[PDB]
Symmetry: C2
Subunit: 204 residues, 2 copies
């Protein structure tokens, strides 16, 4: 029946998650507790008891995540440097003192923005694996930022770009979000790629 | 074993939650999905399929919450008015045009704050059932607010209180948080009680 239908779905949903993480269990004793709970029956474990163990489960989960995080970080830095080394050679790529690299898609003729100016742009940011994490295409509307409020790579690139230009920049993690990053698709020590079209400079 | 131990705890934890809410299920088909998932076996339902039904489960959950919310709201207003009606009589209670009620614990002799002044106070806010939702006792440190940035009942009361006084105010929901309130311990149309000690007035 409709009941039977959903129940499976929820558990299928749940069960995957656990596994994918690190929750090594036995759905038999686990199915047991569920029935106790719903039947409002007396629980095989003291409120305290459970909490005591759950509290230890999370603490150990936290340890696990931190493990992955620090491992991902070391991994992405390694991948990040391989990408840039590989890219340094590619046709049209210029490498700057800061390690920031760019390739000119189309050169503009307007003024280059200063450190304090406001800029209007259109862009798409992607990870080395093509995954798009941000872009003005979705919103269909250009973005406006103050040159100094953006990530270092952008700050470094914009000061070199004539208004009207379209560059593709390749950003070392130290010039993007760095070792930290419990944010969106961007992880720790992730090197990023951006296609940036600088529309105009507001020397405000 | 240690495994068996935890598994139960998690499921006991989970199972309660569902029940307490409205998730009428059968932990048998639900235990089934969990095993499929972990064994990485082929799932009895198409990725789509499950989502299709889960998406419908939440939407129906949302309907359920909204149900409770609106019901709680009508309930708390009724309780709120019974409390104030009962309280209007009690020794020392003054009822104001706005329905706000207060009782003077101890009268100060300083100046009464104006609408724009900053005030320094110590206080404890509780629901009609004694549940404390806020207080400066916990932090051990007085709070400072601008008379107009606080809830109406407070704004109404403070303008009447001589600096140094300690009043207990009984606040109609329309002068506290009103019909809205997906916040802390405070729900919809909840009438509140406060013990407020006005320490000083900064006629800033
Ligand atoms: Zn365009
Ligand atoms: Zn353009
Ligand atoms: Zn005190
Ligand atoms: Zn005092």
């Amino acid at each position: 029946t409709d009941k039977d239908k959903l129940s499976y779905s929820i558990g299928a949903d749940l069960g995957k998650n656990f596994k994918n993480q690190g929750i090594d269990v036995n759905p038999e004793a686990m199915a047991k507790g569920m029935q106790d709970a719903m039947s409002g029956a007396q629980l095989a474990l003291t409120e305290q008891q459970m909490k005591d163990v759950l509290n230890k489960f999370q603490k150990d989960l936290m340890a696990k995540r931190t493990a992955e995080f620090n491992k991902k970080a070391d991994e992405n830095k390694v991948k990040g440097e391989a990408f840039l080394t590989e890219n340094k050679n590619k046709p049209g790529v210029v490498v700057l003192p800061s390690g920031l690299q760019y390739k000119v898609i189309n050169s503009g003729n307007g003024v280059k923005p200063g450190k304090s100016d406001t800029v209007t742009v259109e862009y798409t940011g992607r990870l080395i694996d093509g995954t798009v994490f941000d872009s003005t295409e979705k919103t269909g509307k250009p973005a406006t930022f103050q040159v100094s409020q953006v990530i270092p790579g952008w700050t470094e690139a914009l000061q070199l770009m004539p208004a009207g230009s379209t560059w593709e920049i390749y950003v070392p993690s130290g010039l993007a979000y760095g070792p930290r990053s419990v944010g969106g698709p961007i992880g720790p020590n992730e090197t990023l790629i951006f296609k940036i079209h600088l529309i105009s400079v507001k020397k405000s």
